[PDB]
């Protein structure tokens, strides 16, 4: 809807910064770890395929978690509750048909009650001061796709895959803003399937050159290289289906030429 491409993009670029969570946030959280975070996000991924939600809801949910765990020290028993409650929130925000709450109790395998989920819902809401309309790695990729010469579901798919991979890894990717992570991905995903690269009309639109991307780009590449060997695979299995053109089986480049 080119009438407001830029006008939206710009707004968004400015919103991330606002809805950006605190980098080493896990370092002050006394009873959880970047490690357990992943077990957490990795699961949500899995929840997302079962209940047939949107990629958006993942990215939204992850981010509510990150933001929230940026302010409330939560204990082990409860990380899962926080994460269920945010899934629910991203649901209510973004799906036409949000899963219901009992369905969300069910996927935690009756850990918490109904009340509890709903009670956290609120806290998350209060703590987030109702600011749930976040930009996501998804949002930007979606937009960047439009500058695709020409479009190619594989590249689109891989782009996603990658992008999503970063949800799991609190370090570094908590370092990067979604617009970059999405920059880091789309390129990576291009060069791989078509050996092209960050198209110049996105240098112009986002003002991010190859160079500026590099530090995201390097990390993103590792993370891609080592994806068959990471502790959490739920994403990887996901981008095995035809839905996503089998991209997780594509074999990444072995050197980024950067």
């Amino acid at each position: 809807v080119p009438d407001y491409h830029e006008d939206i993009h710009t707004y968004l670029r400015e919103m991330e910064v606002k809805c950006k969570p605190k980098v080493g946030y896990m370092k002050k959280q006394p009873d959880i770890t970047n490690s357990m975070r992943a077990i957490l996000v990795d699961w949500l991924v899995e929840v997302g395929e079962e209940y047939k939600l949107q990629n958006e809801t993942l990215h939204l949910a992850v981010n509510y978690i990150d933001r929230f765990l940026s302010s409330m020290s939560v204990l082990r028993g409860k990380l899962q509750l926080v994460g269920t409650a945010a899934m629910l929130l991203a649901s209510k925000f973004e799906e036409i048909y949000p899963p219901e709450v009992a369905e969300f109790v069910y996927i935690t395998d009756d850990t918490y009650t109904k009340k509890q989920v709903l009670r956290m819902e609120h806290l998350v809401l209060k703590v987030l001061t109702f600011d749930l309309a976040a930009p996501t790695v998804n949002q930007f990729l979606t937009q960047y796709f439009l500058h695709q010469q020409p479009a190619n579901c594989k590249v689109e798919s891989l782009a996603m895959f990658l992008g999503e991979l970063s949800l799991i890894d609190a370090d570094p990717y908590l370092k990067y803003l979604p617009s970059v992570i999405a920059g880091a991905a789309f390129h990576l995903a291009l060069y791989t399937v078509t050996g092209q690269s960050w198209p110049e009309s996105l240098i112009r639109k986002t003002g991010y050159t190859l160079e500026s991307l590099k530090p995201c780009l390097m990390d993103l590449h590792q993370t891609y290289l080592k994806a068959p060997q990471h502790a959490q695979q739920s994403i990887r299995e996901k981008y095995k289906n035809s839905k996503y053109h089998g991209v997780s089986l594509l074999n990444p480049p072995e050197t980024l030429n950067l």
């Binding site: 357990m36 077990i39 079962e50 082990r76 409860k78 899962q80 996927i107 935690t108 395998d109 850990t111």
Partner: peptide, 10 residues
């Protein structure tokens, strides 16, 4: 059809 699960010590 199998994603329910209890992630940690509660």
């Amino acid at each position: 059809g199998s994603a329910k699960r209890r992630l940690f010590g509660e």
